[PDB]
């Protein structure tokens, strides 16, 4: 809505938005900023503290989560 304190989020989102438009996710992760963001992001999804809005926004730009954990309960 406004600037909020999530300026980092805003900046990184459009950065990853443009990045995924080019590669669709970064399995290597060597681009520094997104690389570090992804590193922290691992624990976000691991812990389950991840925001579904944040989750959805990247999904919508084409950020694939893939099946890294091969174990479907359904």
TrEMBL record:
Domain of life: Bacteria
Protein name: Helicase, putative
Species this chain originates from: Phocaeicola vulgatus (strain ATCC 8482 / DSM 1447 / JCM 5826 / CCUG 4940 / NBRC 14291 / NCTC 11154) (Bacteroides vulgatus)
Included stretch of the parent chain: 627 to 691 of 753
